[PDB]
Each structure stands twice: as structure tokens, then as C-alpha cells.
Amino acid sequence: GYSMFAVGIGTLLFGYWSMMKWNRERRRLQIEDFEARIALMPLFQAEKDRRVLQMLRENLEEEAIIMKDVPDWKVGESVFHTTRWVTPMMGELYGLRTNEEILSATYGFIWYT
Amino acid sequence: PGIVELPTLEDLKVQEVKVSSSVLKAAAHHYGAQCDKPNKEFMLCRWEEKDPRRCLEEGKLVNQCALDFFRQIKRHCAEPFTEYWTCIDYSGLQLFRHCRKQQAKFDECVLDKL
Amino acid sequence: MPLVYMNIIMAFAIALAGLLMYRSHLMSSLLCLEGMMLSLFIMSTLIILNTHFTLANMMPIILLVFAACEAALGLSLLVMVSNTYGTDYVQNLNLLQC
Amino acid sequence: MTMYIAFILSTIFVIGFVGFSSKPSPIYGGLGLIVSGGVGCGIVLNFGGSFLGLMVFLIYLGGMLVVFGYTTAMATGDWVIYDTGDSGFFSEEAMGIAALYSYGTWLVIVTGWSLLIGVVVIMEITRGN
Amino acid sequence: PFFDVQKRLGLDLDRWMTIQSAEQPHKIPGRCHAFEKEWIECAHGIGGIRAEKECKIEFDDFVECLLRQKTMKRLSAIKRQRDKLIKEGKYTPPPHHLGKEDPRP
Amino acid sequence: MFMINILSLIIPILLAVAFLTLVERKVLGYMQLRKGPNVVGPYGLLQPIADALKLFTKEPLRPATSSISMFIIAPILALSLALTMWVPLPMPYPLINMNLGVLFMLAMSSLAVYSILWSGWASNSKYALIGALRAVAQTISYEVTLAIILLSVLLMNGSYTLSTLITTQEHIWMIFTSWPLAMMWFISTLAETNRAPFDLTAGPFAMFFMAEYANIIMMNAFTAILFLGASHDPHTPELYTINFVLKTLALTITFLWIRASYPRFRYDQLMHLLWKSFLPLTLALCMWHISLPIMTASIPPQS
Amino acid sequence: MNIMLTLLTNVTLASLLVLIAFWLPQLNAYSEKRLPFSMKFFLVAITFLLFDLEIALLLPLPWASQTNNLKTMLTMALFLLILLAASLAYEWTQKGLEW
Amino acid sequence: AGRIASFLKNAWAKEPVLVASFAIGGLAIILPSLSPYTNYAIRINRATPYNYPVPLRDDGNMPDVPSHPQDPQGPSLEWLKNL
Amino acid sequence: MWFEILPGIAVMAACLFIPGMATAHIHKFTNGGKEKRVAHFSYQWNLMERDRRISGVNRYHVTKGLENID
Amino acid sequence: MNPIIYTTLIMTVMSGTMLVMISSHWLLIWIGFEMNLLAMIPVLMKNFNPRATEAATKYFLTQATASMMLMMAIIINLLYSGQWTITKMFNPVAMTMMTMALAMKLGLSPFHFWVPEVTQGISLQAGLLLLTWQKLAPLSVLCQISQSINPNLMLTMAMLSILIGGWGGLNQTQLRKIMAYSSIAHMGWMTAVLPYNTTMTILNLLIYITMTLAMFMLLIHSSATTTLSLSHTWNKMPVITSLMMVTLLSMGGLPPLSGFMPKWMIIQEMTKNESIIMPTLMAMTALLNLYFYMRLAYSSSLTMFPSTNNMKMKWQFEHTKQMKLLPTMIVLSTLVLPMTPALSSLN
Ligand SMILES: CCCCCCCCCCCCCCCCC[C@@H](O)O[C@H](CO[C@H](O)CCCCCCCCCCCCCCC)COP(=O)(O)OCC[N+](C)(C)C
Numbered sequence A: 001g002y003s004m005f006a007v008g009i010g011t012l013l014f015g016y017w018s019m020m021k022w023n024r025e026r027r028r029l030q031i032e033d034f035e036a037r038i039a040l041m042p043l044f045q046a047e048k049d050r051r052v053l054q055m056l057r058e059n060l061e062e063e064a065i066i067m068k069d070v071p072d073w074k075v076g077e078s079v080f081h082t083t084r085w086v087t088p089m090m091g092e093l094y095g096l097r098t099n100e101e102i103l104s105a106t107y108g109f110i111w112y113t
Numbered sequence B: 001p002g003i004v005e006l007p008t009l010e011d012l013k014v015q016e017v018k019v020s021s022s023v024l025k026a027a028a029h030h031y032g033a034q035c036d037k038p039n040k041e042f043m044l045c046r047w048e049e050k051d052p053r054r055c056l057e058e059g060k061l062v063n064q065c066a067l068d069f070f071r072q073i074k075r076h077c078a079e080p081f082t083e084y085w086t087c088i089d090y091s092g093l094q095l096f097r098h099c100r101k102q103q104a105k106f107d108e109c110v111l112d113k114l
Numbered sequence C: 001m002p003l004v005y006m007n008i009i010m011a012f013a014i015a016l017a018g019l020l021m022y023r024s025h026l027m028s029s030l031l032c033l034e035g036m037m038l039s040l041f042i043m044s045t046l047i048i049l050n051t052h053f054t055l056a057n058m059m060p061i062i063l064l065v066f067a068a069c070e071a072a073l074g075l076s077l078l079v080m081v082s083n084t085y086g087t088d089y090v091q092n093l094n095l096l097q098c
Numbered sequence D: 001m002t003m004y005i006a007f008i009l010s011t012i013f014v015i016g017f018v019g020f021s022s023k024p025s026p027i028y029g030g031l032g033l034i035v036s037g038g039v040g041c042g043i044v045l046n047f048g049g050s051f052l053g054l055m056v057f058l059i060y061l062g063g064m065l066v067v068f069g070y071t072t073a074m075a076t077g078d079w080v081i082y083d084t085g086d087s088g089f090f091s092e093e094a095m096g097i098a099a100l101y102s103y104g105t106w107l108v109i110v111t112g113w114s115l116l117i118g119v120v121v122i123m124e125i126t127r128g129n
Numbered sequence E: 001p002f003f004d005v006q007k008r009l010g011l012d013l014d015r016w017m018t019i020q021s022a023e024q025p026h027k028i029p030g031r032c033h034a035f036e037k038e039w040i041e042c043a044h045g046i047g048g049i050r051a052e053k054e055c056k057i058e059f060d061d062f063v064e065c066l067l068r069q070k071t072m073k074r075l076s077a078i079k080r081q082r083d084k085l086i087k088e089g090k091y092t093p094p095p096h097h098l099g100k101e102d103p104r105p
Numbered sequence F: 001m002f003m004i005n006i007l008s009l010i011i012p013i014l015l016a017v018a019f020l021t022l023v024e025r026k027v028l029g030y031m032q033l034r035k036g037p038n039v040v041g042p043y044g045l046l047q048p049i050a051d052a053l054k055l056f057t058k059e060p061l062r063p064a065t066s067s068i069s070m071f072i073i074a075p076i077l078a079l080s081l082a083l084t085m086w087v088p089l090p091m092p093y094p095l096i097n098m099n100l101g102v103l104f105m106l107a108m109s110s111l112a113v114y115s116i117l118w119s120g121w122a123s124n125s126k127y128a129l130i131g132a133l134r135a136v137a138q139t140i141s142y143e144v145t146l147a148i149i150l151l152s153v154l155l156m157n158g159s160y161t162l163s164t165l166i167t168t169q170e171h172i173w174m175i176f177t178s179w180p181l182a183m184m185w186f187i188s189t190l191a192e193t194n195r196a197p198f199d200l201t202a203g204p205f206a207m208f209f210m211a212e213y214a215n216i217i218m219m220n221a222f223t224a225i226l227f228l229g230a231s232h233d234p235h236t237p238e239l240y241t242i243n244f245v246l247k248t249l250a251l252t253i254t255f256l257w258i259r260a261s262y263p264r265f266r267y268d269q270l271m272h273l274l275w276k277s278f279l280p281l282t283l284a285l286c287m288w289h290i291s292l293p294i295m296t297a298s299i300p301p302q303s
Numbered sequence G: 001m002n003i004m005l006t007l008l009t010n011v012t013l014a015s016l017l018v019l020i021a022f023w024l025p026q027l028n029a030y031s032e033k034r035l036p037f038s039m040k041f042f043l044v045a046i047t048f049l050l051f052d053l054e055i056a057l058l059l060p061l062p063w064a065s066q067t068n069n070l071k072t073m074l075t076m077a078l079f080l081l082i083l084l085a086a087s088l089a090y091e092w093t094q095k096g097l098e099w
Numbered sequence H: 001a002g003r004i005a006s007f008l009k010n011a012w013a014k015e016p017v018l019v020a021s022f023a024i025g026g027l028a029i030i031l032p033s034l035s036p037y038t039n040y041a042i043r044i045n046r047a048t049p050y051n052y053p054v055p056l057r058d059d060g061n062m063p064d065v066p067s068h069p070q071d072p073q074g075p076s077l078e079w080l081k082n083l
Numbered sequence I: 001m002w003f004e005i006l007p008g009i010a011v012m013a014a015c016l017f018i019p020g021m022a023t024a025h026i027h028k029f030t031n032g033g034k035e036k037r038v039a040h041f042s043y044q045w046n047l048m049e050r051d052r053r054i055s056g057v058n059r060y061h062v063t064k065g066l067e068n069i070d
Numbered sequence J: 001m002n003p004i005i006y007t008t009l010i011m012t013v014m015s016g017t018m019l020v021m022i023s024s025h026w027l028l029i030w031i032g033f034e035m036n037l038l039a040m041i042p043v044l045m046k047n048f049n050p051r052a053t054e055a056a057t058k059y060f061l062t063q064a065t066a067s068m069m070l071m072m073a074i075i076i077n078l079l080y081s082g083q084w085t086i087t088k089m090f091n092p093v094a095m096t097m098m099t100m101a102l103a104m105k106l107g108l109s110p111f112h113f114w115v116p117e118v119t120q121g122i123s124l125q126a127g128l129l130l131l132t133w134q135k136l137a138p139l140s141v142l143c144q145i146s147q148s149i150n151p152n153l154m155l156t157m158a159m160l161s162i163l164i165g166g167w168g169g170l171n172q173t174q175l176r177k178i179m180a181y182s183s184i185a186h187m188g189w190m191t192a193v194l195p196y197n198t199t200m201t202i203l204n205l206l207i208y209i210t211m212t213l214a215m216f217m218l219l220i221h222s223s224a225t226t227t228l229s230l231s232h233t234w235n236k237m238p239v240i241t242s243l244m245m246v247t248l249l250s251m252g253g254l255p256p257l258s259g260f261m262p263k264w265m266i267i268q269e270m271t272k273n274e275s276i277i278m279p280t281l282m283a284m285t286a287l288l289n290l291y292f293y294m295r296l297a298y299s300s301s302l303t304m305f306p307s308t309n310n311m312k313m314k315w316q317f318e319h320t321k322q323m324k325l326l327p328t329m330i331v332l333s334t335l336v337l338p339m340t341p342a343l344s345s346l347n
């Protein structure tokens, strides 16, 4: 009776110790991966800013071409009273683009399995 | 109310870094250690200005610095780096744990050369 | 205000009308209440996720919990009514009157 | 674009609500309620809230509507409101929901007390006498 | 009516969830953090009536950030005019909007 | 090449649940000092084909007075859930990789009782309705403990992802970390799928039988992945596939062995067993497994 | 999209197999010739519902473990589980679990 | 003392499941406040970088803030490595 | 004797061998001989999109190495 | 039920009301309402019988519908302005729906139908708790957002409530239905001054609570439910009938009794805002409440109805249980007019 309980508790303790060591190693590996991402971040941020600005500029050029005949339209008019920079919506960038990349941008991460 | 100002497409032209994500991850640590100053300047400017249009020069600087770093790597340690990033690329999660051996070879090579 | 929110409020209004119509079968009344609750959950989830109001992600779950509790309570009452009458027709609850 | 898939799902949600709102044969109204709940979970999952959608699909359908059916048997335009940036190396919804234990101490306390009182109330009501 | 026990005891039972810009986990920002911050700072210690009358610009910007009704109206107008022009045949989309562009990282 | 993957995941499962009947008959026969089917075909290999042909050529006994709608809906739902509950499973790469795989499995398992409820309601008999009510009550009662044990075990994994379960058990099986939870989980899976000692109870009948056996194999594969991890070498997944299949087959043989070696519980006896022996222990062990990583500073990584 | 395709394939295959099994024997012509309402079942259903709600509250624990407020999170989780145990105990002692 | 021991002996018979459950629950409640590794767990959770560390603007009066990641100033994760 | 149960079991083993490796092989054939890239947490998805845009073939598995740095 | 369980349920009801009153979050207020509703049901069903069950299910249905409407209003308000704090509603539709939800919770007409039946089905003790305690949370919520409520909707609902209470009180014979209609009329009086001065609302609430507590305790003391059972009381405890008649005169608004303090004061406030027709209408309507109170007083104390022989045996036994605070309630509900200015305490 005592022997069975002792064997069970010993197995539990051995498993706990092994899992402790392995989980600490996993924590260290996760920190290493996060540090790699942190090191790589600024280049991605710069590229994202450049891409967003280019998309906005192309949309502005197309708006200037199209809205030429509308009487009261002001090309590139902000809808906010403030002059602070405002992050554009998905529709502000992909409004005039083809439909497949619209779907990719709006739904790719959710639909990727 | 007002007109938004956007930089011309000639202001957004820069030599892009045309390497894939696995290649970037392979040399992420050395890139962070060596190219730290332009990256930190750009990121501080980004967090202080709160405006993408006020930080174009720092973006061009960080692109140029990354290109210089990769040119040095290509000049000196092309082959060990190629093996290392190939191994990193094969895995689905791109784990550093898979091939510590190639990483050790690349680290010792780049410590010997540069 | 996009069409998704309009459709969700329309669903809530339809469920409320169904609850207030009261043909018979008090179980149908409880079902209408829980349809209204489900519409509330969907609308709140969409609103909270759209604006990235992170700390508000707790709100739907909590809501659901409480509402489900009420449903349980309601069911209990329904059971007792049947145990007194043999069936759950709404028209049987006419002992009390104004 | 997928013929306004969010709009399709919303319209199917409304159709199911109309179907079960007429209250025909409460078991059939229940079936309409499961259909509507599945459509709503689809909407939530499509939007991006995976955990909350699975939460609906588990709790609501599996437990609560199942208890409803048990008791019944015992008796006789889009895609433009979205974001631009990324969530980082985590899911924002999961972090916000898991913040229930570190931030929402008051919510946890009141909800637990309410559930315990609900147990007591159910026992008292169904005791009979 | 409203017995402000919290402010008397400084407990903060339920004030952390009231607004978007109040100590989110991992410092995840709200979608309209800046506008809400601006409106809150405009209307603090001013009173309800004066805040409604005087800080209307900030609240209008905040509501525009939340719902984006005006942006939707503008985009819909642009899309409708573009569709009309492409129906008449006086406008042709550039390669960038046809998928033939050169993508950038 | 995605529909090919779906078909190559669906058809082999159906063939496996076809031959599981033959394997079960052979195992029970040899445990009962006899032989199983060994006349039809070389070693009974053609028995499932004969059984399927006989079932599909036999007239159905439609009540002609019940609700045909739910009567035909229930097998659809049962088989659909049984087939769709296989896609999150990583062997070793899941067909559909989902962040919240375990919650999805739990949700489908919870939905599985609608087939029982609707079949009982549409049977148009008070005795069948009573049997369906008892089955539903037992299933939901045991699924409560299933969910609690599942979250308590996953507390050491880091997240609800199924693939991460391979990484967590890279050095040691999870059977050693928590065996009591594993035994209670095994009994809960036995009681959930209506198997001895918990089995109180043409076309649609075969549909239900296939759904039940597919659920058996799914539960056993899930237990093998969750508690008995296999080494995974990224450059050769065949080793992991072989190990996982062998462990699943061992657990299925254990299911048949348990059915053949024990009497059956009463309804009230099994309800007492759950509500007064599993649930208190489940709560205590869940508290222990909440507190353990904080005690030992071994919190799993992913978040 | 992939999961939608998988679900559609599963449902379509199941429906096709069910209908062919239902109609294959139908081509060949043949002869072609309450009150009780036990309360215990309802009580167990309600108990399951309430425990399901408490499990729904408990579910976000795997992500709740990384907060830097380990003491508060641990206290709250143990409080929730203690309330669950207390509810079960109250149901037990007042003969709420009898057949 | 004697009555409590007698009651525990009685409960260990004819009701072992409840005794085991209560013992495990009590241990799980009590032990974390005594274990010395819980602070280590808190520190490990604190040391995981989830967000980008935004650099501070230098003003000449920040000796504790390193100017480069390699610099000796700043928090160190050697204690984690030794674990 | 007892080993006569082995054939049928073997068949089940084969019927359980088919799915797993099949997926693996498909996951290689569609992804250029490498493991399928998993994308949780919405950061790896941005990486996959960046590789897709970089490759110039509109496939993420086409990896542009150091030779593209000029 | 067990006394401990009853005490726990009462504590839970009070805790829900306290949570509603002391919270600054819409979600927490909704949680408090749900807790109140959840714990309030068994109090109605303490004495099990079909009437109690039917009343409890009517109450549950009405309260659940009101709570769902309140949550929908909160959702719309959050949608049109990302604010959870209980303040200006920032939306007309949300304010309208929340006003209907709080009207359903309170019992204002035309959502008044459930009050007489729920009061009639359930016991005197349950009724006393339901009539006075329940009003505190919805009234606090209405006071917190009085600057946003539309005066037209609140004023027309208050006028309709006064009319309906006055008219319906005339017909009823059972005392519990008379109390239900009296509560409806008093709440019509009390919610009419919300847009102008919430202090008058609180003062009227306190005075009404004192009066109805005194009257319900008197009805419990002399165990009478119908009018004739009350008429029999004079033969045993004439003092109870006299005190009840004085309290009834107070509840009708007769000066110099305490019940005149709210109405008068309320009228004064609506005269400061150039509202003259409405206070006159509500006064002439409260005349009906006065009429049926006077009829009850005629039946109870001012005349001696025929008695019964068995009542002789009741002369020999005394009331074993005495309820404390009854004399205080009577005094506070009858003789506190000269201390009217104390309402400046912002009670
Ligand atoms: C103070 C009055 C006491 C007597 C009156 C009691 C009235 C009813 C009882 C309920 C009130 C209890 C007050 C609890 C309020 C919670 C907030 C406070 O406690 O601070 C918390 C401290 O947490 C404590 O651990 C709370 C533990 C209390 C819960 C255990 C027992 C609760 C029982 C209450 C009754 C429930 C039913 C009965 C159970 C027996 C926050 O911790 P902290 O880390 O700084 O902040 C984290 C947020 N960050 C990230 C922004 C920093």
C-alpha cells in the first residue's frame, strides 16, 4: 500500500523536475526569438511607412485625375479638423485597387490555416 | 477642413533590401548589434514625431546601413551564412534551436573575419 | 455606420417583437430572450474588436455568463408552472388580474 | 470580393431570427436558434475574434441551448472599418480576455458571487413544497 | 443616488475599464487613443455644459475616428464617380490598380 | 492540392472505422477463448465489406409517422462532426493549423449531443425519449470533467495549439507529469462515447455506428497526442506518424479490452461516480496544476 | 476559406452517403405493410449549465499565467475554483445530487 | 488532538477521495506563499520582451542607461541563463 | 491462434498511415520542398507577405538569398 | 426556507442595489441589476403556492426584458461614443431605450401592468420589500442621467402613471392591489420632477418609503388582506385602526401631515420652471388617491363593521412578535412637516 503511493509520488516529482528544466529552456528560447524580432523591427517599420505613403500618394493622384470635373470637390481634403497625422483605414489605401489584393489585405491572416 | 500633404514618389525611392525573412532572421542578432545607432535614431524619431512623413531620412539611413551590413557579410562569410539561412528557412517556425551547429560555424567565421 | 451593425440591430428588434408577440409556449418567450442576448453578444463583440479596446474584451464573456444564469433561472420557473398545470401555455397564468 | 460575405452572413442571421421569431413548435424555433447562433459565430470568427466566436460556439450551443432542448423534450460596405497595423507577437483579444485575472478582480468577485447565489436560488426554487 | 465610495477610499474598483486610453495590457493602444486623449484633456474640470459647448471640435474628431462616416461618404463618392467614368469610357485605371504594378517590401 | 488532402484524410478514417469492427470482433473472440470471423475472406478481412453490403441493401424501417426532417438530419450532424473533428490533429503537421485547436475540439464534442437529442425526440416513443434523456445527461455531465481536465493539462503547455503539444513533450511524456488527470481523462473518454462499462443503451443505423467508431478513434488519437508524446524529427515525419498510429492502436485495443473485461455500471451509479469522485478530485488537481508552475517558476513560454 | 471548404466537403460527403444509403433499398419494391417529468433530470441539466458557465470563466487561464501580477492572478484563479467547489458542496449537502 | 486524529483516520477509511481532494487543494493554496521560486517566475515573466524598447533621448545625465546594447549598463539576464 | 488478429490490425494501421504522411508530402510539394510556414500572432503573416512581395513570383516559398543584395 | 439562506438572499439583494448605486461603469450597473433580479425571485416564492409562482414568473419576464433593453441601450451609447462611464448619454435613441428600460424596471405606465398582479400574488412581506427597496436602483440611475433625459417622454409617462394609479385604485378591494396602484401613482408624482430637481425626487422617495413601510407594517400587524378582514380589526386592536387611518390621511396629501410635504414642494419646483398646467393636473388627479384612501378609512376605523363570534377568542391572546421601528415609521410619516427645510441636506 505504501509502496504504490511512494512510486506514484516519485514519478510525479521526477516529471515535475524534468518539466521545470524544459520549460525554463523554452523560456530562454522564446526570449532569444523575441530579441531577434526586436533587432529586425526598425527596417520593417521603415518599409511599412514608405509603402503606406506611396499607396496614399497613388490614391491622391488618381483622385486628382478623377475628381477634375466635380465642381465643389477639394482634392486631398482631410475630414479631420486637426492637422495631426491619422493612420488610414484599409479602405483608404485599397479603395481603388483590384479586388483580389483587397481580399488578401483584409482577410489573409484570418483565413490562413 | 485642410489639405493633407504627402511626399512625392521621388522622395520615397530607396534601394530596397531584397532578402527574404529567413535570411533576415539568420543575421538578426549581428544586424542588431552592429547597425544599432541608425535603427535607434530612426525609432526614437518615429516615437517622438508621431508622423511617418517627418522620418524619411532616417528610413533611408537605416536601409543604407542594412545594405552595408549585408554587403560586408557577402564579402567575407558568404558560404557559412548561406548554409545557416538555408537551415533556418527549411523549418516551418524558423527555429534557432534546430541547427545551432551552423549558427556556431557562422559566428566563429564572422568573429575570425570581422 | 455600416450595414453589419444595422442588420444586428434589426435582428435584435425582430427578436424583441417575437418575445412581445406571445402566441403561446412560454419556452418560445425564453428562446426569444436568448436570441436577443445572442444579438447583444455579437454586436458588442464586433464593436469592441473593431476599435481595439483591449481591456473591454472581458465584457462579452461576462455578459454571456450572467445572461445564461438568467436563462437557467427562467427555465426553473417554467418547470414549476408546468408541474402545476401539466403544460406551459401562457394563457394558463390568469389567476392574478388587475 | 466575396459578394459581401459579412453582409451575406448578417442577412442569414436576420433570416434565421425571423424564422425562429414566429415561435413555431418550440423545438423548431430552437433549431432556428442553433442555426442563427452558428451564423453569428461565423460572423465573429470572420471578423477576427477567434476566441469569442469559439466561446459562443462552445458555451451557448453546447451547454445552454442543449439544456433548452433537454427541457423542451422533457415536456410535451464591409472590410473598410478594419485596421492598418499589426498586433505584434500576440493576439490582442487573448491578452485582453486573459487580463480578467490581473485587472478585473472586481468583475471576478461579483461574477463568482452571482453564480454561487444562482446555484442557491435554483435549489430553493426547484425544492418545491 | 451615486455614492462615490471609490473616490472616498481611492479603491479603483471599476475606473480602469471606463476609457480606451487607460493602462491597456502590454501597452496595446486603442484605435482612437489620440482623439480620446485630446477630448478628455479638453473637457477635464470644465463641467458638462461647458465641455459640450466648447470641446465640440475634439468630440467631433473622436466620433469621426470611431465611426468614420465622413471617410466612408468620401470613398463612396469617389468610387461612384470612377464607376460612372469607366462606364462612359473616359477613364482607365493605371497598372498599379490592375495588379500589374511592382510590389515593394 | 487541398481537396486531395481532405479526401486523403476522410477516406482512410472511414476505412479504419470499417476494419475496427472486425478487429474488435477478433479481439473479443480471442479473449473469450474462441475465434472471430475467419470464414469470409482469408482471416475475416472481407467481413466489413459483407456487413456494409448487407446493411445498404436492407429495407429501412422508417416509422412513417415521425418527423422525417430531424430523423434524416441527425445522422448528417453526427457523421459531419465525427469527420470534422480530425482536421486540427497534428500527425505531425495538421491539415488545418489553428491557434485554438483544443477549444474547437471541445466545441464540436459539445455539439455532438444534438444528434442524440434529435434522434430520441424523433423516435416517437416514450421509452426511446427516456433513453435519449439519460444518454444526454451522462454525456454532458462527463464533458464537464473533460473540459476541466483539458484546461488543467494545457496549463503546462502554454496555449491551446495542438502542435505545441509535440514540443512540450519532447524530452518526457506528459503521462509522468500528471497521471491522475490522465486516468480520469481516460475514464471520461470511455463514458463520453458510451462504451462499456458505460453503455446503458439500415442506412442511418450504419451512419450512427460509423460516427461512434470515428469518435472512438478520434478520442484515442487525442489522448495519444495529449499524454503520450512522440519524438518528431522535422526531416522525417514518418517516424512520428508511425509512433502516433501505434499509440492510437494500442489505446483502441485497450478500449476493446476494457469492454470485454468488466461488467457495466448503473445510471445512478455512474452519475454518483462522476459527481462525487471525479469532480472533487478534478477541482483539487486543477488548483494544484494552476499553482505548480508559479511554485516551481516553470511557466510555459508561449502567450 | 480552407476551413469553409473542409466543412462543406464533410457535410456534402455525409449527406451524399446518407441519401444513397436511404435510397438504395428504396428502388426494390417490397410489401410496405409522457406525464412523469422527473425533476432530477432537469436538476442535473441546470447543474451542468452552471458548471459550464464557471468553466467558461476559468478557460483563459493558459494566457492568464503571463501577467507579472502572479500573486493577484493566482489568488483570483484559486478564488474562482474555491467558489466552484463551494457550489458543488452546497449542492451535495442539501441532497441536490440524489436519484 | 486525539479527536482530530481519530476523525482523520475515520475519513481516510470509507472516504479516501474527499480526503485526497482536500489535501491537494490545501497544499495548492498554502505552498506558493512559501516557495522561494515564485519571485523567480515573476522575474522571468518581467524579462520577456513583448514590445519594442523605445530608446530615451540623451541629455548627458543618464549614467545608468546604456548607449549600446553591449555596454555593461542596464539589466542583465545572467541569472536566467544560470537557471 | 492469437496472431491471426494481427492482419486486420495491420490494415487499420495502414488506414491510419495514409493521412499523416500524405499531408506532409503535400505540404512539401506545394511549398517548394520545405515545411509549410505557420503564421500565428499576425507578425509571421507580415513576414510571409514581405517574402511574397520580395520574391517577384508572388510565392512566399521562393526565397531570395544574399545573391539578390547586389 | 432556511433562515441562513433567506438572510443570504436578502444580503445579495441589498448588495446588488448597493453595487448599482456606487458604481461608475455601465457594465457593473447591469451586473448589479442582474444580481438584484436573480436574488429577488426566491423572496417572492418563500411561501410556495401557484399564485406566488405565477407572480414570480411575471416579475422575472418583465425584469429580464427591461435588463435586455438596458444592455442594448448601453451598447448603442458605446457605439456612438466609446465611453463606459455613466454620464450624458451622447445619443437620442440610446437615451430613449434606456428610459423605457428604467420605466419597465420602475413600473411607470404604460409598463405598469405587472405591479398589481405581482403584488397580489406574493405575500405581504415580499410585497413590502418589492414596493420600497426595488425603486432605489432605477431611481438612482435616472437621477444620475437626468441632464440627458427628454422632458417630453418622462413628463408624459409620469402624467399617465398618475392618471392610471388614481383611476385603478378606485375599483380594487384587496389591499395589496390598492398598494400597487398607490405605488404607481406615487412614482408618477416622483419621476415628474426628475428633469428639474433630483433633490425633490429623493425627498419624495424617502417620504413615500416611510409611508408605505408604515402602512405595510400595520397591515402585517393586523393580518388582513381584503377590505372586510381589515374592517374586523377594530374589535381587537382599535389603536391599530386609528393609526392606520392617520397614516392613510397622511398618504393622501392632507396637510399638516407629512404626506403634504413632497407634493407641495414638487409643485413649487415646477412653478419655478414656468410649468403651471401640469402641477394643477397632478393635484386634481391625486384627489382620486385621496378618495379611495378615504373609502378605506371609512371601512376600517371611522365606522364599526359587524364582527364575528369567534373573534372573542382572539381577545385573550397578544401579538407575540413586535416589529421594531413601526412607531418611528408612523411618526416620521405623519408629523414631520415643520421640519421641511431639512430637505436642504440634499437627502
Ligand atoms: C475594504 C472593505 C472590506 C469590508 C467590506 C467588504 C464588502 C464586500 C466584499 C467585497 C469587497 C472586497 C474589495 C476587493 C476590491 C478589488 C481591488 C483591490 O482589492 O485591489 C486588488 C488587490 O487584489 C487583491 O488580491 C484582492 C483579493 C480579494 C479577493 C479574495 C476574497 C474576496 C471576498 C469578497 C466577497 C466575495 C464572496 C464571499 C467570499 C468568502 C488589485 O490588485 P493590484 O495588483 O494592486 O492591481 C492590479 C491592476 N494593475 C495591473 C493596474 C496594477
Ligand SMILES: CCCCCCCCCCCCCCCCC[C@@H](O)O[C@H](CO[C@H](O)CCCCCCCCCCCCCCC)COP(=O)(O)OCC[N+](C)(C)C
Residues within 6 Å of the ligand: E001, E002, E003, E004, J203, J206, J207, J210, J332, J333, J336, J339, J340, J341, J342, J343, J345, J346, J347
Ligand atoms: C421622514 C423623512 C425621511 C427620514 C429618513 C430616515 C432618517 C434616519 C436616517 C439616519 C441618517 C441618514 C444617513 C446617515 C449619515 C451618514 C451618511 C452620510 O455620509 O451621507 C451624506 C448625505 O447625507 C444624507 O443625504 C442626509 C440624510 C438626512 C435625511 C433627512 C432629510 C429629510 C427632509 C424632510 C424631513 C425632515 C427630517 C424629519 C426627521 C428625520 C453624504 O452625502 P453625499 O454622498 O455627498 O451626496 C449623495 C447624494 N447625491 C448623490 C444626491 C449628491
Ligand SMILES: CCCCCCCC/C=C\CCCCCCCC(=O)O[C@H](COC(=O)CCCCCCC/C=C/CCCCCCCC)COP(=O)(O)OCCN
Residues within 6 Å of the ligand: A009, A012, F180, F182, F183, F184, F186, F187, F197, F223, F227, F258, F262, F273, F277, F278, F281, H014, H015, H016, H017, H020, H024
Ligand atoms: C507531494 C504533492 C503530490 C501532489 C498530490 C498528487 C497525488 C494524488 C494521489 C491520488 C490521486 C488518485 C486519483 C485517481 C482517480 C480516482 C478515481 C476514483 O477514486 O474513483 C474510483 C472509481 O473508479 C472506477 O472504478 C472507474 C472504473 C472504470 C473502468 C476502467 C477500469 C480501470 C482499468 C483501465 C486502466 C486505466 C488506464 C489509465 C492510463 C490511461 C493512459 C492514457 C472510486 O470509486 P468507488 O470505488 O465507488 O468509491 C467511492 C465511494 N467510497
Ligand SMILES: CCCCCCCC/C=C\CCCCCCCC(=O)O[C@H](COC(=O)CCCCCCC/C=C/CCCCCCCC)COP(=O)(O)OCCN
Residues within 6 Å of the ligand: F276, F279, F280, F281, F283, F284, G082, G085, G086, G088, G089, G092, G093, H008, H011, H015, H018, H019, H021, H022, H023, H024, H025, H026
Ligand atoms: C480549504 C480547501 C478547499 C478546496 C479544496 C477542495 C476542492 C474540491 C473538493 C471539495 C468538493 C466538494 C466537497 C463536498 C463535501 C460534502 C461532504 C459530504 O456530505 O459527504 C459526506 C461524507 O463525507 C464525510 O465523511 C465528511 C468529509 C470527509 C473528509 C473531509 C476532509 C477531511 C480532512 C481533509 C484534510 C486531511 C488532512 C491533511 C493531511 C495532509 C497529508 C499528511 C456524506 O457522504 P455521502 O457520499 O453523501 O454518502 C454516500 C454513502 N451512503
